[PDB]
Amino acid sequence: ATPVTIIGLGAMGTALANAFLDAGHSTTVWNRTAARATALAARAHHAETVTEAIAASPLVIACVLDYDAFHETLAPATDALAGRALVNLTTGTPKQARETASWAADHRIDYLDGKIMAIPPGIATPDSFILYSGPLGTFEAHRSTLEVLGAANHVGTDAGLASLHDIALLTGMYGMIAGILQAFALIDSEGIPAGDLAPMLTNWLTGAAHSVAHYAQQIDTGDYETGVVFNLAHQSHGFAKLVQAGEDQGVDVGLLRPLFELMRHQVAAGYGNGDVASVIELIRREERR
């Protein structure tokens, strides 16, 4: 029954507000532009300033463009934030997440840094989950409430950890996106619709997604050799056909050159009998090699 307050009513903010009203939470809303709050008020208290939105709820959820937008909005109202739960679901770096979290510990604000792994329509469906990092007490207080938005997964007390997980998950997805676009550009070079390849490509990538754990185990033991089916020397040999075909077809293949480069270096450095995961030794933190 927890009253909640939403700061920022963009596409993501609007979905959060709407999901709470559905679950029956006394919802207060606020936005830098009053228009966006209008439909919400029809179905929610539209507070006229940041402090009114803040003061109405023990839980304050902020969700604006970037962190610079996060300061200017809420930095004047620290004292109104004192003794409240402030959940900041704004995209940014781990460094930003930890700076903001110590700032929030100075002014007695129970800070939680969160990152939505969902698209606005997906809120309040089993497809949404949000990662939170920061004090386990703050999080555990509002969990059932936050479970309105979707799954709530606390990933650590280090405040930047949700941000790190978020960036890691998006780098995963973006890598796949570049693969997909490159695959489509290749098949497009002979006039085939993307739609003709989509079902096969979806199945292929779904199976490929099961090697994640394979790579993890290789990275965690440092053994890139045990259980390799098609080794790196062979992958690098064949990968070169992917690049030469691409330019035979008039298709740019620069999206794949960086990984290819790393693979070829690890082959030349002696890792050709192991798996492609050994590439990680060229891009991980130096201290961890």
Edge-first strand order for the sheet with 59-62 is 45-46, 27-30, 4-7, 59-62, 85-88, 110-117, 129-133, 151-156
Q: Locate 200 and state its tokens.
A: 């096969």
Nearer to ligand NAP among residue 31 and residue 145 (C-beta): 31
Nearer to ligand NAP among residue 188 and residue 234 (C-beta): 234
Among 28, 31, 100, 278, binds ligand NAP (CB under 6 A): 31
How far apart are CB 139 and a second copy at their closest, in Å?
17
Q: Locate 196 and state its tokens.
A: 């003709």
Distance, CA of 242 to CA of 224 (rounded, Å): 23
What part of residues 74-113 is at the interface with ligand NAP (CB under 6 A)? 89-91
Residue 120 makes contact with ligand NAP by CB under 6 A? yes
Q: Locate 203 and state its tokens.
A: 């199945």
Q: Locate 7 and state its tokens.
A: 């700061």
Residue nearest to ligand NAP (CB): 10
264 interacts with, out of ligand NAP, a second copy, none, CB within 5 to 8 A per kind? none
Residue 119 makes contact with ligand NAP by CB under 6 A? yes
Residue 19 makes contact with ligand NAP by CB under 6 A? no
How far apart are CB 285 and a second copy at their closest, in Å?
4
Distance, CA of 237 to CA of 231 (rounded, Å): 10
Contacts with 154 (C-beta within 8 Å, 6 or more apart), sequence order: 131, 132, 133, 136, 139, 140, 143
The alpha carbon dihedral of 19, 21, 22, 25 has a sign of positive
Among 25, 36, 98, 154, binds ligand NAP (CB under 6 A): 36
58 interacts with, out of ligand NAP, a second copy, none, CB within 5 to 8 A per kind? none
Report the SS3 class of residue 254.
coil
18 interacts with, out of a second copy, ligand NAP, none, CB within 5 to 8 A per kind? none
Residue 168 makes contact with ligand NAP by CB under 6 A? no
Distance, CA of 138 to CA of 58 (rounded, Å): 11
Residue 221 makes contact with ligand NAP by CB under 6 A? no
Q: Which residues bind ligand NAP (CB under 6 A)?
A: 8-13, 31-33, 36, 63-66, 69, 72-73, 89-91, 116, 119-120, 229-230, 234, 238
